[PDB]
Symmetry: D2
């Protein structure tokens, strides 16, 4: 069975229950809702469908709300026509959202473009298709020198590598998309363009402002500042999504795999889920097979140690959504199966539980948990055993779906430590994960508040 979990963005080709059900089947574990597009009724029905499928089949899934977040865009061109920039030329950016640009100038949606930039700074346009150098700044104008030939279209993304931008943490719309999220009760929010811990807290404050206080916040690392503030961001969030594509636009190429690796490792050490994201099977938006280069990159994320892998357009609008979920899974299964535990108070207990589980060959580790901490603490060592996580918190069951190799199970009550061992035993067996005569290792907390894992116990089924 794979352990690495797969997050799929759901779109209109993939939203029916029927599809939903086909996807959980091929390996889907979380549904992602990309608020870059769609309205609240579409999303709602999507949430509802999933939830339907869920109730109908007994499968579990989780629901991740992706915010759209702050951005700087170029706007419109003459006659809606493309313009050819030429290396060396001068090109100029205007804050005047009224201007209609041409081959010499264009407007930008971001009234602060002037202040945040600085002569010498680089401007990149259309996910890096064109780069320019800033020569001068005056009035509403940024004047640059195009450093390379390319066609500027209408409404294009601008990157300001190394630059810190004064956009706020939450775009405007952004705020209403989280309220919605709270109202529907999503299990995670993936917040875009995080650059500093201050940005996390703002998102937590909104959530908490709307009853979304138990919603896990996944900060998306997408540029250099964020990369820089990684540690403090990480400390404030419940987890991370490394966006290779965005990073590869903001920072030196040779540094992007190293950033992924690093972030991945700090997550696992912090007990915070991490998602590996942009540019996974993108060729499948158009083909029914990924390329070899693509297969190795995902493999290598799994090997880097991620908890989950994510499909974007491959599953939202491509022509083979189910073919991607399916190859995405054989690759997880196959990568996962050649990985090893990493042994190298919660910690002591949990490493011991894992080390023991392995020494006794137990196929299963059973953990009791309120917040999900102890299922994460065991997953920190990359057990060979599957983790059967019992909990009475619904949210916690949902959120554990995202964790590597955990199988959450919602229970009505856990009266006591021996009560857990009994129940854990029943379930072990009920789960077809183990059979009479297997050793099982059961971890939980005893006379300690949630957040402390201090007890390990070996049992024979």
């Amino acid at each position: 069975m794979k352990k690495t979990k797969i997050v799929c963005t759901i779109g209109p080709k993939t939203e029916s229950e029927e599809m939903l059900a086909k996807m959980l089947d091929a390996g889907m574990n979380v549904m992602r809702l990309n608020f870059s597009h769609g309205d609240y009724a579409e999303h709602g029905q999507r949430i509802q469908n999933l939830r339907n499928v869920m109730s109908k089949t007994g499968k579990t899934a989780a629901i991740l709300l992706d915010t759209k977040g702050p951005e700087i865009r170029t706007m419109k061109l003459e006659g809606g026509n493309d313009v050819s920039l030429k290396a060396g030329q001068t090109f100029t950016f205007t804050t005047d959202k009224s201007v209609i640009g041409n081959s010499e100038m264009v407007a930008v949606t971001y009234e602060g473009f002037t202040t945040d930039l600085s002569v010498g700074n680089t401007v990149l346009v259309d996910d890096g298709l064109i780069g320019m150098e800033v020569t001068a700044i005056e009035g509403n104008k940024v004047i640059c020198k195009v450093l390379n030939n390319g066609d500027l279209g209408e409404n294009k993304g601008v990157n300001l590598p190394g630059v810190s931008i004064a956009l706020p943490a939450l775009a405007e719309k952004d705020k209403q998309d989280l309220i919605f999220g709270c109202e529907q009760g999503v299990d995670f929010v993936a917040a875009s363009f995080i650059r500093k811990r201050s940005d996390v807290i703002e998102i937590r404050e909104h959530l908490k402002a709307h009853g979304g206080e138990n919603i896990h916040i996944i900060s998306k690392i997408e540029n250099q500042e964020g990369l820089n503030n990684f540690d403090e961001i990480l400390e404030a969030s419940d987890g991370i999504m490394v966006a290779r594509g965005d990073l590869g636009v903001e920072i030196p190429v040779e540094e992007v795999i190293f950033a992924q690796k690093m972030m991945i490792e700090k997550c696992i050490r912090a007990l915070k889920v991490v998602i590996t994201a942009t540019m996974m099977l993108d060729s499948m938006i158009k083909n029914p097979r990924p390329t070899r280069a693509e297969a190795g990159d995902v493999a290598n994320a799994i090997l880097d140690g991620t908890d989950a892998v994510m499909l974007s357009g491959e599953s939202a609008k491509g022509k083979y959504p189910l073919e991607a979920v399916s190859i995405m899974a054989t690759i997880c299964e196959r990568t996962d199966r050649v990985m090893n535990s990493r042994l190298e108070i919660t910690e002591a207990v949990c490493r011991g539980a894992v080390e023991t589980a392995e020494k006794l060959d137990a196929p299963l580790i059973v953990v009791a948990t309120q917040g999900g901490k102890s299922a994460r603490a065991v997953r920190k060592y990359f057990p060979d055993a599957t983790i059967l996580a019992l909990t009475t918190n619904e949210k916690t069951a949902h959120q554990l779906v995202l964790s590597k190799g955990v199988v959450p199970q919602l229970v009505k009550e856990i009266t006591s430590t021996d009560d857990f061992y009994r129940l854990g035993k029943e379930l072990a067996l009920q789960s077809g994960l183990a059979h009479k005569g297997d050793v099982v290792v059961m971890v939980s907390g005893a006379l300690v508040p949630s957040g402390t894992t201090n007890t390990a116990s070996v049992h024979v089924l």
Copy 2:
């Protein structure tokens, strides 16, 4: 505080309570009754007094009954006079108990002296004072050549180094001594001259026949057969007693330390106490200080890893019983304090507990136990932590006194695993062995019959 336990033989100079009380204070932990001498009323008062002091002070101790054992002795001499044997001479042993010997021959109490011996065999007499070689066996006669000059007194101990003797496991007085042992409820019986598992089983059966089935049997290895059968002996015993002295007459001197070593190591591995015994502070039978040679010997037995050290004549009849108890304990304390854990299902759990105890610096390990198994399973690793051992079994409480660094405590009930943690926490504190904020590691068995230790939990006081 020392960990190594002290076994003291009680004699008529040490039997008063007052004494008993000054000895428990100096470090005695178990009182040995040597049934080589004394009658049942003496011994009984002895037990009674000890049990007195115990109830009067709240101290705990254990009682070990030492059997006297089968033996081969030489018998009487003309006029009760000693005869000087001379190297080179012919000398002869006769199984004819009626014979009254002289410088040419003497009788032996052991009818099988001529069948078990063989031409070429060595006979030793009077604790190795004189040796001889067997040249011929015929009729009731064993004819030797005296290898060395010496004087043969009457009624002396004979050693048949390397020979297997068909004396029985037990002697006619040995059997009454154990029934007495049973009526009095001693905690352990140290059986003498054990040579083969069969001997153990006989002992076990005799005890079981008289309600003594819960008495721990300690086999005394005193000769080469025993040594050879170590492994099946150990398997059948609840423990061992290494009698260096005897060993030293029966086997090559250079092997004796090695025997002691080996045997201590296999006891600890098997979870069976072991006692290091003859020749420990014997000089103190006459002096109030042991000799430096002597001190190293004990120290070294502690370092070889023994649970206990045993005082003989030094405390039963010597002039300085309480000086010997006291120098024995400073040595214990001083050696014990420079030792280290040896980490290298029950086992996995216990090693981890100890291993975790040390990583979190816990001064105490608290164990629940019926039989004593789990307290011994944790001592296997020579913890730095004291072991606080809770049990509802009184016998168990007593026998655990003999175990290295265990403090046993009798409780009225342990209703459940959470119950134990609460209970063990109160006592940990109550015992002044830890204080508020110390980490304590609690071990027990959860949903498993006695004899399985499968649970470890860390708690802060």
Copy 3:
């Protein structure tokens, strides 16, 4: 300084000396000649220029001759027009090179298509684009079931995975390329489409037949067969080139990274250079910057542990040959720099030399070597020190260019072990790789025929 070495394929845009010089400068260590194209006089001049640059600058490089190898093509179609085949359809292959095919069958260049195939076998066409089932073979005809929809273009590769083809190993045109190679004295021959150890030997026998017995043979694993016979291939060759692209055609995607990994690992253990090859910075054939996916793929090859990385079209015919050498190198330097030694008779000595070098902090390991084995043997552990390799064999010095982090140096004589230490100290200093006061670890063979490394010696500069 980077360690991982860079093989660059030289073409007509890159062959000047001027260029050659600018590339050595950017990181090129080996020139690859792609015999898929060009003639003997172009090649010869290429070799000669490289050799000029070398002699003029003192730089060292090595020269790798790639053979072209055996193939199986589909041929021409009606009007040069594509024809779309549809699943379930019957389609068929003819050996008759005169047929002009259409939607129902085409011609293949390999007369033995019929005998080597077998009803039930799979035929793959066009780098796997379309697959078919062997239904029938009769006459000059192999008849199959198209298993998937696609369009057959003209002149398309065919793969017969699992099947052994009777094509010889060395194409009788190819044979000519090796002779040339021997006359010019290339350092390595990379042999195409190796499937089995018998294929290696065939190459070796040709080389030996023409004075090229000292030329290292790199087998290119490019298919399932080869993959399967990897071990016996490895044993017969002097090294390997893992051709991910070809592999990805013949075998299941999700296995392709795993094959690379494996193969890299058994190389290093065997002391046989390994190159990682197709699909490295291909985008740069057209852009001056690779993609972030490409940059992690290389990195990851370096992390998998390859000795070298190779540029194909990026440096032979693309628009930015020197931009690819150069990003290729920053990526090497960058990856190389965060890697660690792998410690985990030649073996014992060399492991030790490395472990010692690291404990003493030596910036450099000096090795004496005839065949190169002792430089590879130290390189097996990924030392942090640079390897300075002395040798009197010219071929040895050239081929060591291809080894990870080795700096070869040709010397006139090494009279004795003490002579080596003296010489090796001079050169260490002469090299600016160490300075007065650094520890240096010197490894060599003493009173042993080449092929044994038995001597290690530490010295201060």
Copy 4:
């Protein structure tokens, strides 16, 4: 073959060549000359005989001159008659060399007895036979209370446990003894009663004053001050002699084994031989068999790690000198055979050499050495391999007998590193310590002054 070396004191019953030859044969490796007795002619003939046996048999031995050292002694008594002291009594010591003592007072040979002592201090007399408490010091008088009954004989040794004494490093007769030592070319001097480094230097200076600069100095630690200054003593000495018995009168008994342990461990770490000495087989002064306690104590000293063991009286005047040598060696052979290497620039080189010897199973390590350092450095790790040590220095060959498991061999020249491997191979073979096909590890120094071991080489015979 035993590794532990045996130091035998040579007296008049053992000085004949015949005897010397029989002992070399039982295991004697060094001859000790105890200058507490004999005159120069006796000793010289003793040296001569041993040297004879040597030359006659090709055996090697070393010679060790034991200084008598300074002392405090009680002097004469009225009529030469013993006086019984009674506990509680007052008894007084006088500095006045003229007094003739009785039961109330006696004189001491040590003028500083009054200054160095203090009220409260303990004075022991006649090897601890009697102890007394100092109550008052006045004039030439030290007044005490006898703590125990006993009889005072004349001319008896006194201990001031815990006291520092201003006796000089050396006695007047000690000085003449060393001059003789130097004339005879003894190999080691064991200096008695070393308390502080200053003492070692004194000894060194006198030796140096008389051509004895190459004689190794072995400090004897006999008292608490000694013990306290251990480290600086060690540093100055070429080695140590642990005098357990002396220690045992000067310091708490329970510290004495720990003293031995510690000092044996710091000698091995410092590459300085150590000798375990008083109280080894003393009972054999009178019997032909040691006691079991005795045998454990030695074995245990070999296990603590000493390089040598020493016979005293047992081999100088006892009745069974050759039985004591002989049991001393069985015990050595038997304890030594169950030990293991301890692996845990000279160092690095040497640990690896041993580590490699074991991994390749080499039965011998051959070392080149001027001063003996590298032989000691390999021995530091308790190799299972014998050390064959080639040197050109005869003193060095001699002193190396004293080291654990080294076989020293005097050679005429070692021209070069390869020369060494050649030679070492011949001799390895010539020594019947190895055979064709055995791996041998050869260690030395290459292009480094003596005192640096930087080269290790593996060879097959």
